Amino acid sequence: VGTLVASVLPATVFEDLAYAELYSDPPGLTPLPEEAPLIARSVAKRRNEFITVRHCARIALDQLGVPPAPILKGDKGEPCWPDGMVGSLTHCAGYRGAVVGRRDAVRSVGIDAEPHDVLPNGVLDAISLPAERADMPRTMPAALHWDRILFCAKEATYKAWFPLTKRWLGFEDAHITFETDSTGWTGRFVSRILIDGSTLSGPPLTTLRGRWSVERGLVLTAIVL
Ligand SMILES: CC(C)(COP(=O)(O)OP(=O)(O)OC[C@H]1O[C@@H](n2cnc3c(N)ncnc32)[C@H](O)[C@@H]1OP(=O)(O)O)[C@@H](O)C(=O)NCCC(=O)NCCS
Ligand code: NA
Ligand code: NA
Ligand code: NA
Ligand code: NA
Ligand code: NA
Ligand code: NA
Ligand code: NA
Ligand code: NA
Ligand code: NA
Ligand code: NA
């Protein structure tokens, strides 16, 4: 079983998390009939990864004692987790993953996987603030593609934020600061929210702490609130 995503999960709430990942689409996976409408008009690549990522979601939920069931799609694409559960899903070339948590210990999860590849510069200025572009090179080893790592953290931030607020969060609306561990391939980040953080219940979101990792040609990030 693969354990790349454990490199970005916390120990403090680990017993209330579970995860499952795969690196390709198993052949011949049939969609659940209740989930098939979600991909009824989708291209084959989207259908195949959707079915794999939902499979990972149910394996991870089963570890937390949740019986397998369909996971529908809600406001703005967000997955509809079973009662008492939270989680997040991601895919990219070579990666499909789910991390889920018990809501009584975990308020929200956001994860993202990317290929550890450059982004174009025009995609970088649209996805970053000036202070990020100044500070990332100061805090990240020169071997790493900081543009891509910053973007991966932006995506995990939106996924952790949206289920709590049900509002947009733009690339300009969170300033993310990083640190690198002395081993050079993992570290921590903090996403500072620059807009109103009001949530549907509980205290407003102001800073979201996460972890990042680069390995096996992938960037992984996770935020567990
Ligand atoms: C929604 C988004 C973050 C998804 O990320 P992605 O890199 O395109 O794709 P991933 O495979 O990593 O993640 C897709 C999964 O995200 C989840 N997701 C989609 N919308 C979501 C939402 N509103 N809230 C939480 N999770 C959501 C879904 O599980 C989806 O997979 P599924 O359709 O198979 O269920 C991205 O497409 C997007 O729209 N980003 C713009 C918002 C943003 O990044 N703001 C910057 C904040 S600092
Ligand atoms: Na457990
Ligand atoms: Na695999
Ligand atoms: Na559902
Ligand atoms: Na969610
Ligand atoms: Na990809
Ligand atoms: Na360094
Ligand atoms: Na600012
Ligand atoms: Na910050
Ligand atoms: Na930084
Ligand atoms: Na590592």
Describe this structure in words.
With 225 residues, this protein is of the alpha+beta class. It has one domain. It has helices at 44-63, 121-127, 130-139, 146-165; strands at residues 17-22, 85-92, 95-102, 109-115, 174-180, 186-193, 207-215, 218-224. The PDB classes it as transferase.
Radius of gyration: 17 Å
- Percent helix: 25-40%
Can you write the helix and strand succession as a string? EHEEEHHHEEEE
Tally the helices: 4
Bound molecules: coenzyme A, sodium ion
Question: What is the strand tally?
Answer: 8
**Widest beta sheet: strand line-up:** 4-8-7-6-5
Question: The biggest beta sheet, please?
Answer: 5 strands, antiparallel
Coarse shape: globular
> β content, as a range?
25-35%
Structural class: alpha+beta
From the structure provided, what is the oligomeric state, counting identical versus distinct chains? monomer
Spatial separation of the terminal alpha carbons:
25 Å
- What is the total domain count? 1
Quickly describe the structure:
The protein has helices at residues 44-63, 121-127, 130-139, 146-165; strands spanning 17-22, 85-92, 95-102, 109-115, 174-180, 186-193, 207-215, 218-224. With 225 residues, it is an alpha+beta fold. The protein has one domain.
Topology of this structure?
Elements: E1 17-22, H1 44-63, E2 85-92, E3 95-102, E4 109-115, H2 121-127, H3 130-139, H4 146-165, E5 174-180, E6 186-193, E7 207-215, E8 218-224
Antiparallel strand pairs: 1-3, 2-3, 4-8, 5-6, 6-7, 7-8
This protein binds coenzyme A and sodium ion (NA) (10 copies).
Keywords: Magnesium, Metal-binding, Transferase
Binding site for CoA: 46, 54, 73-76, 90-91, 112, 155, 159, 169
Binding site for Mg(2+): 112-114
